[PDB]
Design an enzyme around this catalytic site. Structure first.
Site, PDB file in Angstrom:
ATOM      1  N   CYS A 193      -5.877  -5.187   7.947  1.00 13.98           N
ATOM      2  CA  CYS A 193      -4.704  -4.504   7.425  1.00 13.98           C
ATOM      3  C   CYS A 193      -3.645  -5.457   6.902  1.00 13.98           C
ATOM      4  CB  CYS A 193      -4.108  -3.590   8.498  1.00 13.98           C
ATOM      5  SG  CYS A 193      -2.872  -2.428   7.869  1.00 13.98           S
ATOM      6  N   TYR A 245       3.349   4.646   5.304  1.00 12.54           N
ATOM      7  CA  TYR A 245       3.616   3.543   6.215  1.00 12.54           C
ATOM      8  C   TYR A 245       2.777   3.728   7.456  1.00 12.54           C
ATOM      9  CZ  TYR A 245       7.541   2.663   3.175  1.00 12.54           C
ATOM     10  OH  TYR A 245       8.199   2.400   2.013  1.00 12.54           O
ATOM     11  N   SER A 246       2.102   2.666   7.871  1.00  8.23           N
ATOM     12  CA  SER A 246       1.295   2.718   9.075  1.00  8.23           C
ATOM     13  C   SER A 246       2.225   2.981  10.249  1.00  8.23           C
ATOM     14  CB  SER A 246       0.616   1.381   9.314  1.00  8.23           C
ATOM     15  OG  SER A 246      -0.100   0.949   8.185  1.00  8.23           O
ATOM     16  N   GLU A 272      -7.566  -1.310   5.685  1.00  5.81           N
ATOM     17  CA  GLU A 272      -6.443  -0.609   5.099  1.00  5.81           C
ATOM     18  C   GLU A 272      -5.529  -1.657   4.499  1.00  5.81           C
ATOM     19  OE1 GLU A 272      -4.248   2.819   7.006  1.00  5.81           O
ATOM     20  OE2 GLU A 272      -2.647   1.317   6.965  1.00  5.81           O
ATOM     21  N   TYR A 292      -2.977  -2.696   1.081  1.00  5.11           N
ATOM     22  CA  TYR A 292      -2.128  -2.056   0.094  1.00  5.11           C
ATOM     23  C   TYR A 292      -1.260  -3.055  -0.651  1.00  5.11           C
ATOM     24  CZ  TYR A 292       0.572  -2.574   4.427  1.00  5.11           C
ATOM     25  OH  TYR A 292       1.161  -3.013   5.593  1.00  5.11           O
TER      26      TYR A 292
HETATM   27  C1  LIG Z   1      -1.768   3.325   3.933  1.00  6.47           C
HETATM   28  C2  LIG Z   1      -0.545   2.483   3.612  1.00  6.47           C
HETATM   29  C3  LIG Z   1       0.153   1.971   4.607  1.00  6.47           C
HETATM   30  C4  LIG Z   1       1.291   1.185   4.379  1.00  6.47           C
HETATM   31  N1  LIG Z   1       1.949   0.682   5.414  1.00  6.47           N
HETATM   32  C5  LIG Z   1       3.046  -0.023   5.250  1.00  6.47           C
HETATM   33  C6  LIG Z   1       3.777  -0.600   6.435  1.00  6.47           C
HETATM   34  O1  LIG Z   1       3.455  -0.437   7.608  1.00  6.47           O
HETATM   35  N2  LIG Z   1       4.914  -1.342   6.145  1.00  6.47           N
HETATM   36  C7  LIG Z   1       5.367  -1.588   4.861  1.00  6.47           C
HETATM   37  O2  LIG Z   1       6.371  -2.279   4.671  1.00  6.47           O
HETATM   38  N3  LIG Z   1       4.637  -1.071   3.820  1.00  6.47           N
HETATM   39  C8  LIG Z   1       3.541  -0.307   3.951  1.00  6.47           C
HETATM   40  N4  LIG Z   1       2.856   0.129   2.860  1.00  6.47           N
HETATM   41  C9  LIG Z   1       3.427  -0.041   1.455  1.00  6.47           C
HETATM   42  C10 LIG Z   1       4.497   1.027   1.275  1.00  6.47           C
HETATM   43  O3  LIG Z   1       3.911   2.300   1.147  1.00  6.47           O
HETATM   44  C11 LIG Z   1       5.295   0.980  -0.040  1.00  6.47           C
HETATM   45  O4  LIG Z   1       4.366   0.703  -1.136  1.00  6.47           O
HETATM   46  C12 LIG Z   1       6.185  -0.288  -0.077  1.00  6.47           C
HETATM   47  O5  LIG Z   1       7.037  -0.160   1.061  1.00  6.47           O
HETATM   48  C13 LIG Z   1       6.992  -0.440  -1.282  1.00  6.47           C
HETATM   49  O6  LIG Z   1       7.592   0.845  -1.605  1.00  6.47           O
HETATM   50  P1  LIG Z   1       9.032   0.881  -2.288  1.00  6.47           P
HETATM   51  O7  LIG Z   1       9.388   2.263  -2.393  1.00  6.47           O
HETATM   52  O8  LIG Z   1       9.844  -0.039  -1.501  1.00  6.47           O
HETATM   53  O9  LIG Z   1       8.725   0.253  -3.738  1.00  6.47           O
HETATM   54  P2  LIG Z   1       8.578   0.888  -5.222  1.00  6.47           P
HETATM   55  O10 LIG Z   1       9.996   1.080  -5.557  1.00  6.47           O
HETATM   56  O11 LIG Z   1       7.641   2.032  -5.138  1.00  6.47           O
HETATM   57  O12 LIG Z   1       8.057  -0.311  -6.004  1.00  6.47           O
HETATM   58  C14 LIG Z   1       6.674  -0.503  -5.979  1.00  6.47           C
HETATM   59  C15 LIG Z   1       6.240  -1.063  -7.303  1.00  6.47           C
HETATM   60  O13 LIG Z   1       6.748  -2.391  -7.495  1.00  6.47           O
HETATM   61  C16 LIG Z   1       5.676  -3.242  -7.929  1.00  6.47           C
HETATM   62  N5  LIG Z   1       5.361  -4.459  -7.074  1.00  6.47           N
HETATM   63  C17 LIG Z   1       5.003  -4.549  -5.729  1.00  6.47           C
HETATM   64  N6  LIG Z   1       5.051  -5.782  -5.242  1.00  6.47           N
HETATM   65  C18 LIG Z   1       5.430  -6.593  -6.335  1.00  6.47           C
HETATM   66  C19 LIG Z   1       5.675  -8.015  -6.504  1.00  6.47           C
HETATM   67  N7  LIG Z   1       5.952  -8.922  -5.544  1.00  6.47           N
HETATM   68  N8  LIG Z   1       5.642  -8.484  -7.757  1.00  6.47           N
HETATM   69  C20 LIG Z   1       5.658  -7.588  -8.756  1.00  6.47           C
HETATM   70  N9  LIG Z   1       5.719  -6.246  -8.728  1.00  6.47           N
HETATM   71  C21 LIG Z   1       5.534  -5.798  -7.457  1.00  6.47           C
HETATM   72  C22 LIG Z   1       4.571  -2.262  -8.405  1.00  6.47           C
HETATM   73  O14 LIG Z   1       4.918  -1.712  -9.707  1.00  6.47           O
HETATM   74  C23 LIG Z   1       4.699  -1.212  -7.294  1.00  6.47           C
HETATM   75  O15 LIG Z   1       4.077   0.036  -7.737  1.00  6.47           O
HETATM   76  C24 LIG Z   1       1.730   0.925   3.054  1.00  6.47           C
HETATM   77  C25 LIG Z   1       0.973   1.493   2.006  1.00  6.47           C
HETATM   78  C26 LIG Z   1      -0.114   2.256   2.256  1.00  6.47           C
HETATM   79  C27 LIG Z   1      -0.845   2.812   1.040  1.00  6.47           C
END
Ligand SMILES: Cc1cc2nc3c(=O)[nH]c(=O)nc-3n(C[C@H](O)[C@H](O)[C@H](O)COP(=O)(O)OP(=O)(O)OC[C@H]3O[C@@H](n4cnc5c(N)ncnc54)[C@H](O)[C@@H]3O)c2cc1C
Length: 303
Positions: free
Chosen positions: A261, A79-80, A301, A303
């Site tokens: 971003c 998360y940023s 950046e 994602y």
């Molecule tokens: C450098 C970086 C910075 C980030 N910064 C932020 C930030 O500031 N704020 C923020 O909220 N997030 C940020 N993210 C994204 C964050 O890391 C997580 O990926 C996101 O919050 C979702 O994680 P989770 O554990 O909630 O979901 P998970 O339970 O890990 O589910 C993710 C999976 O669901 C699926 N998926 C995603 N979107 C959809 C959709 N609408 N339709 C279908 N399938 C889908 C894919 O299979 C994905 O791998 C950032 C990512 C990176 C790489």
């Protein structure tokens, strides 16, 4: 892990997954106003009792509890960082995140699927302990040059690193705390969200615009309230196209840095707009952009 401070000016990996920093949640405040779409929370963590230091543009990892569907421990999600190095209270004791709850569709077995780490973070109570790693990232760093022009193209939570730049640049308490960085350049934020109540940090962004009209321009792309010229919903790529000649002229300045971003998918339309503008002066944008990247002036950046 804890021994992780034997290098550079930019802090990286002070804490790693095998021995994360255990921080405490101070607050968890909603950012989406009534009538908005979704849940985006501003979460502030206490860093006291550890040595986690960070700078603007970096990210931290959060290791959520639980096991995945195979019974394996959940891995960290990045998360940023949404706060400046000094934290929201300018006391060098906290760190903040801007987290959107991920939730989705049926053609992915079940019904409404909730993201693991994002649901965990968005519903977390003050006082709870959280496993934090990082910081990580050297791609979205802000130049120390106070005369820099900074173009920020953000969608949704992509506003997070932008908030760290802008707060460092324009908040009274930040300016008093950073004598060496008295910003006098030009900053332009193009922010894409679906609705007005979804404009994260609206009151504060607009406050900055009012106090610094010559140093900061704020442009929104609100899809459910604005339409582009083709009749479609207004997206960030449409605002970029609308201001392509201007953005290209600013990009030509040696002091200009551009930051992109948000969720992946915005880049293609932004390049298309800038390519058309660049082409008028006999420049191929794809080639110019590689040079900008190599010079460290094009930061992305997604994602
Ligand atoms: C450098 C970086 C910075 C980030 N910064 C932020 C930030 O500031 N704020 C923020 O909220 N997030 C940020 N993210 C994204 C964050 O890391 C997580 O990926 C996101 O919050 C979702 O994680 P989770 O554990 O909630 O979901 P998970 O339970 O890990 O589910 C993710 C999976 O669901 C699926 N998926 C995603 N979107 C959809 C959709 N609408 N339709 C279908 N399938 C889908 C894919 O299979 C994905 O791998 C950032 C990512 C990176 C790489």
């Amino acid at each position: 892990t804890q021994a992780k401070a034997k290098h550079a000016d930019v802090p990286v990996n002070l804490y790693r997954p095998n021995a994360p920093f255990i921080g405490k949640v101070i607050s968890n405040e909603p950012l989406v106003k009534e009538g908005g779409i979704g849940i985006v929370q501003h979460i502030k963590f206490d860093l006291t009792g550890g040595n986690l230091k960070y700078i603007e543009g970096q990210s931290i990892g959060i290791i959520p509890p639980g096991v995945d569907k195979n019974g394996k421990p959940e891995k960290l999600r990045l998360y940023s960082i949404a706060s400046t190095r000094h934290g929201d209270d300018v006391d060098d004791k906290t760190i903040s995140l801007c987290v959107r709850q991920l939730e989705y569709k049926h053609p992915e077995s079940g019904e409404t699927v909730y993201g693991v780490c994002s649901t965990y973070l968005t519903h977390i109570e003050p006082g709870s302990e959280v496993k934090i790693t990082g910081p990580v990232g050297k791609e979205m760093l802000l130049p120390d040059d106070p005369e820099a022009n900074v173009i920020m193209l953000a969608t949704g939570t992509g506003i997070a690193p932008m908030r760290t730049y802008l707060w460092r640049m324009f908040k009274d308490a930040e300016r008093a705390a950073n004598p060496e960085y008295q910003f006098k350049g030009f900053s332009w934020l193009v922010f894409g969200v679906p609705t007005t109540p979804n404009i994260l940090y609206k009151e504060e962004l607009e406050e900055i615009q009012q106090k610094y009209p010559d140093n900061f321009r704020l442009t929104y792309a609100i899809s459910r309230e604005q339409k582009n010229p083709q009749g479609g919903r207004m997206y960030i790529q449409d605002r970029v196209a609308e201001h392509a000649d201007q953005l290209w002229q600013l990009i030509k300045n040696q002091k200009t840095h551009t930051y992109i971003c948000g969720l992946r998918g915005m880049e293609e339309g932004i390049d298309a707009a800038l390519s058309a503008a660049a082409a008028k002066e006999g420049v191929t944008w794809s080639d110019y952009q590689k040079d900008l990247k190599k010079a460290g002036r094009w930061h992305v950046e997604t994602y």
